[PDB]
Design a protein around this ligand. Structure first.
Ligand code: FMN
Ligand code: FMN
Lengths: 198, 199
């Protein structure tokens, strides 16, 4: 049995394209693995705080309740990530970057000695053995163009903490009409079917 | 006479590497252009809110909630400020392979359809024109021109979209390798800054 962790980050709630893709992933995964446990963390519904001077200080004198709470949340998020086998991440493109909702999550899980460390061989990620799937929706078409810096960035960040097995699924041209959008979702769903079947 | 807008984003206050670079930039600009006015907005000291579902609604009628009203007023303020200056200095250190969230929130409030960019018969076009931008980016490690630096290309893409195509990049890398290496990195960065100021 595998445990699947789904991280939603869209700020569009019910109208989220990436959220619709994560729902499809969950639907298909539950159908294939009826015993698998799925945990969903909606980073928009339940926001993670912005990494500021006070919080970064906490992650490395007495701590204020705010700092204590943020540290506890960081621990929770990290423990949750390490406890699951399949990590599904919704990462749509907002102003050429990922949603701040997801960025805040990354800023709290990237911690020296906890999710990565340095050895005789150099930097080594500590979140091992995971299978990750990135579901990224975009209004325009950026894949394989100089304007898509989020896919490369996600690969680098995830790799740094140890998640190197990352499948990227894209749904682009969403803002170019119901036809283009519909075909984008269909090809993304086909991509998800492949991941689920793998 | 030119008006310089300096955007600070480090969360390290007085220990900020990028902050120290922006201070040098300011010091040098004041030396070479004694009549220019400098405006500084510290995005850590005076934080911009996170773009959430409610706030994005504020930027496009349906009545706005009190929070959306404030967010819209802030967006207008930030945009008016950006358009009112000639030289835009942006501190953009690398935090977990991305820029600081403090700066990202600022970007999310200044990117507005019909105000900082629009669509014409020529396609998308930025509305923040005639600007000279200078990015000051410090890193603990060394990433320039490698696959681990996605911030430089991202900044060029974002700024260009709103119209700022004239962008100079200044890097200070290897800060995490000790005081000796950091000093040389700071020294080279200051030399690059001198050239931008003298241009
Ligand atoms: C605040 C905001 C900023 C956006 N910025 C961009 C952008 O820079 N480029 C692009 O192609 N689409 C952009 N979009 C369009 C979205 O990427 C597209 O609608 C995506 O499918 C939305 O996914 P969502 O439901 O998952 O979060 C933006 C949408 C919002 C709400
Ligand atoms: C939360 C946080 C994340 C960081 N992430 C990275 C990173 O991914 N790569 C790197 O080379 N340095 C990284 N650094 C090191 C900084 O880039 C370096 O110390 C920089 O000079 C800090 O500038 P600051 O005072 O200007 O904002 C990080 C520092 C902090 C506080």
């Amino acid at each position: 049995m595998s445990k699947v962790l789904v991280l939603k980050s869209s700020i569009l709630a019910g109208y989220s394209q990436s959220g619709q893709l994560t729902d499809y992933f969950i639907e298909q995964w539950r159908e294939k693995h009826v015993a698998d446990e799925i945990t969903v963390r909606d980073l928009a519904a339940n926001p993670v705080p912005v990494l500021d001077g006070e919080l970064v200080g906490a992650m490395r004198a007495p701590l204020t309740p705010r700092q204590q709470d943020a540290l506890a949340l960081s621990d929770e998020l990290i423990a949750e990530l390490k406890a699951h086998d399949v990590i599904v991440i919704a990462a749509p493109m907002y102003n050429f970057n990922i949603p701040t909702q997801l960025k805040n999550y990354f800023d709290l899980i990237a911690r020296a000695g906890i999710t990565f460390r340095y050895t005789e061989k150099g930097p080594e990620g500590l979140v091992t053995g995971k299978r990750a799937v990135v579901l990224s929706s975009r209004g325009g078409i950026h894949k394989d163009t100089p304007t898509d810096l989020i896919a490369p960035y996600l690969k680098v960040f995830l790799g740094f903490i140890g998640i190197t097995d990352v499948n990227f699924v894209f749904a682009e041209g969403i803002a170019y009409g119901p036809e283009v959008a519909a075909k984008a979702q269909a090809d993304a769903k086909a991509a998800i079917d492949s991941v689920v079947a793998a």
